[PDB]
Design a protein around this ligand. Sequence first.
Ligand SMILES: *C/C=C(C)/C=C/C=C(C)/C=C/C1=C(C)CCCC1(C)C
Length: 137
Amino acid sequence: PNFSGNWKIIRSENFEELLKVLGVNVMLRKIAVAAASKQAVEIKQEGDTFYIKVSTTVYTTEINFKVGEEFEEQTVDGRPCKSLVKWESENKMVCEQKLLKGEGPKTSWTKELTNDGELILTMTADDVVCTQVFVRE
Ligand SMILES: *C/C=C(C)/C=C/C=C(C)/C=C/C1=C(C)CCCC1(C)C
């Protein structure tokens, strides 16, 4: 594969419905949808080690992991979790998450590089799947 690059969002679907499952109230959901439309992702991949920076206009967060090794990050709605990334194929990885504290919907995410040069991110809470599509800058 190779996920390395600077990626800019071109499409974002079902993000509000995801936030709704996660308990976010309507006005905040609308503002978060707007923020998501400015999302940028920077990736550096070395073998199965990933450094990922996801940002919007006013916020930035860094995700560092190695495939197959547990790490800590946060769920979409901001709750600390334990995460584990595995490959599903040559160019797709899937992350399963578990809340460090309490209960909540079952969340996960995937990243995929398509043959047409897009990066597809999916984020899931229970039955609801958000799909976001990026292209290289
Ligand atoms: C591997 C790529 C991942 C895990 C991308 C994670 C992206 C986020 C957690 C972004 C979340 C956002 C919200 C929850 C609302 C505001 C808009 C975003 C895109 C910053």
